């Protein structure tokens, strides 16, 4: 029993069980399958789901909150979506939310704070200008509906399933997609991502109480700019970064922790230097490990040469 290889899937966790859904490979993986990885025993189980099963998608944005799985956005065979689903862990339910939803998009991030799911950025269609924030077209998408990056922040209030947008202060990060978000306390961190012609190395956080954006400028050596990397809270003071894809299209296998209190990056030694990954997933276990799954070992933009993986990589940190 083992899930097929894939990139752009989602993985979420309760610290013990890792739930894996979707993604594509060299196209989309079966929509009705939900793969569960037991972090303690190392075994996989597959279960088939029912209800309002979402279309097979890559680049969806998922979270696990009290064993309830929430899923937003993604890219299916007919384009991007802004649908919102939940799965209480065998039956998917599509939730018809109130308020103005975000624009249809994929490759974004989410912070969880109390009752709120807070989504940021991503890549998709031109919004209705009702949305506030900025959207910038990817000029090359006109040559293959045009799409672009956004820096939007949206709240889905799980108390009422109503969409809204906070008024924020400070300088938001530029629009971006394939960035990584991580939450610690009331701070929603975001690192790197793709915007225009760069895969970036900037680090910000949004205060989830005051809605104030802050840019972090760590002292000393910082990880190379990248997208399609993972960033994972592993303590109340450390974010674990792995892998990704550079501006110059290099697949990455370096691992770092960002120490929040010291505002310092620390490069992490590990046995997987020859196993670079991008568009993988990463989940923190209760025993201090980061469980990496899936993703692609080389440049996935060369589709016929793409090396998608179904390997589990375990980082003990």
């Amino acid at each position: 029993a083992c899930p097929a290889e894939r990139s752009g899937h989602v993985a979420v966790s309760d610290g013990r069980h890792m739930f894996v859904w979707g993604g594509y490979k060299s196209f989309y993986l079966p929509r009705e399958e939900l793969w569960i990885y037991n972090m303690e025993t190392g075994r996989w189980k597959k279960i088939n789901t029912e209800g309002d099963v979402p279309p097979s998608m890559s680049g969806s944005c998922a979270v696990c909150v009290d064993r309830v799985l929430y899923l937003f956005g993604g890219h299916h065979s007919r384009g991007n979506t802004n649908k919102f689903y939940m799965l209480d862990s065998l039956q998917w339910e599509r939730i018809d939310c109130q308020g103005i939803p975000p624009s249809s998009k994929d490759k974004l991030g989410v912070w969880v704070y109390k009752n709120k799911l807070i989504f940021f950025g991503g890549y998709g269609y031109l919004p209705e200008d009702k949305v506030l924030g900025t959207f910038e077209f990817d000029e090359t998408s006109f040559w293959n509906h045009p799409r672009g990056w956004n820096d939007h922040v949206h709240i889905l209030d799980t108390e009422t399933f109503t969409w809204s947008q906070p008024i924020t202060t400070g300088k938001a990060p530029s629009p971006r997609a394939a960035h990584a978000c991580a939450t610690v306390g009331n701070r929603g961190f975001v690192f790197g991502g793709r915007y225009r012609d760069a895969r970036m190395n900037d680090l910000h956080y949004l205060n989830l109480d005051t809605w104030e954006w802050n840019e972090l400028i760590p002292q000393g050596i910082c990880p190379v700019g990248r997208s399609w990397h993972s960033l994972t809270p592993v303590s109340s003071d450390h974010l674990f970064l792995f892998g990704g894809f550079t501006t110059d299209k290099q697949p990455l296998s370096d691992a770092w922790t960002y120490c929040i209190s010291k505002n310092e990056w620390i490069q992490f030694n590990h046995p997987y230097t020859e196993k670079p990954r991008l568009w993988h997933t990463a989940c923190a276990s209760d025993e201090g490990e980061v469980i990496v799954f899936g993703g692609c070992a080389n440049n996935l933009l060369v589709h016929h040469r793409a090396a998608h993986s179904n390997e589990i990589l375990i980082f003990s940190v």
Binding site: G8, Y24, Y123, N144, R147, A177, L301, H303
Partner: peptide, 7 residues
């Protein structure tokens, strides 16, 4: 291919 555009 369209799913990986924009990253």
């Amino acid at each position: 291919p369209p799913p990986m555009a924009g990253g």
